[PDB]
Amino acid sequence: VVGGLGGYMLGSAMSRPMIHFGNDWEDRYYRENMYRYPNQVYYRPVDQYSNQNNFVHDCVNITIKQHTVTTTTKGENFTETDVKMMERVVEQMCVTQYQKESQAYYDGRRSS
């Protein structure tokens, strides 16, 4: 049961999303430190989606939780600064995974 998710869709991996905090040093900090954050994110299928926002936040919390729990259990943690930078990344990755799978649905009417 994916360690203890009940059954969140663990997505596949990614490459560096284009986070733009509005700052300069944050973007550079992120670009040096991006390895500290996961490749992949946890969510539900578009088959039972309803809300973007509520689904996004619940993913964001649950992948934040897992990095801050299923790594912190051993001895692996972050800072408020890394954590907020993670909230950006976890969102962009979560958003992208929904967008990938739901666009496959919304594009999936072009037998043209």
Swiss-Prot record:
Disulfide bonds join C59-C94. A lipid is attached at S111 (GPI-anchor amidated serine). It comes from the Eukaryota. Disruption phenotype: No visible phenotype. Mice develop chronic demyelinating polyneuropathy after 60 weeks. Mice show abnormally low iron levels throughout the body, and are mildly anemic. Iron accumulates in duodenum enterocytes, suggesting impaired transport from the intestine to the blood. Mice deficient for both Prnd and Prnp have the same phenotype as mice lacking Prnd; they are born at the expected Mendelian rate and appear grossly normal and healthy. Females are fertile, but males deficient for both Prnd and Prnp are sterile, in spite of normal mating behavior. Glycans are attached at N61, N77. N-glycosylated. It is found in: Cell membrane; Golgi apparatus. Highly expressed in the brain, lung, kidney and heart. Expressed at low levels in the liver and spleen. The normal, monomeric form has a mainly alpha-helical structure. The disease-associated, protease-resistant form forms amyloid fibrils containing a cross-beta spine, formed by a steric zipper of superposed beta-strands. Disease mutations may favor intermolecular contacts via short beta strands, and may thereby trigger oligomerization. Contains an N-terminal region composed of octamer repeats. At low copper concentrations, the sidechains of His residues from three or four repeats contribute to the binding of a single copper ion. Alternatively, a copper ion can be bound by interaction with the sidechain and backbone amide nitrogen of a single His residue. The observed copper binding stoichiometry suggests that two repeat regions cooperate to stabilize the binding of a single copper ion. At higher copper concentrations, each octamer can bind one copper ion by interactions with the His sidechain and Gly backbone atoms. Monomer and homodimer. Has a tendency to aggregate into amyloid fibrils containing a cross-beta spine, formed by a steric zipper of superposed beta-strands. Soluble oligomers may represent an intermediate stage on the path to fibril formation. Copper binding may promote oligomerization. Interacts with GRB2, APP, ERI3/PRNPIP and SYN1. Mislocalized cytosolically exposed PrP interacts with MGRN1; this interaction alters MGRN1 subcellular location and causes lysosomal enlargement. Interacts with APP. Interacts with KIAA1191. Interacts with ADGRG6. Belongs to the prion family. It is linked to Found in high quantity in the brain of humans and animals infected with degenerative neurological diseases such as kuru, Creutzfeldt-Jakob disease (CJD), Gerstmann-Straussler syndrome (GSS), scrapie, bovine spongiform encephalopathy (BSE), transmissible mink encephalopathy (TME), etc. Its primary physiological function is unclear. May play a role in neuronal development and synaptic plasticity. May be required for neuronal myelin sheath maintenance. May promote myelin homeostasis through acting as an agonist for ADGRG6 receptor. May play a role in iron uptake and iron homeostasis. Soluble oligomers are toxic to cultured neuroblastoma cells and induce apoptosis (in vitro). Association with GPC1 (via its heparan sulfate chains) targets PRNP to lipid rafts. Also provides Cu(2+) or Zn(2+) for the ascorbate-mediated GPC1 deaminase degradation of its heparan sulfate side chains. This is Major prion protein. It comes from Mus musculus.
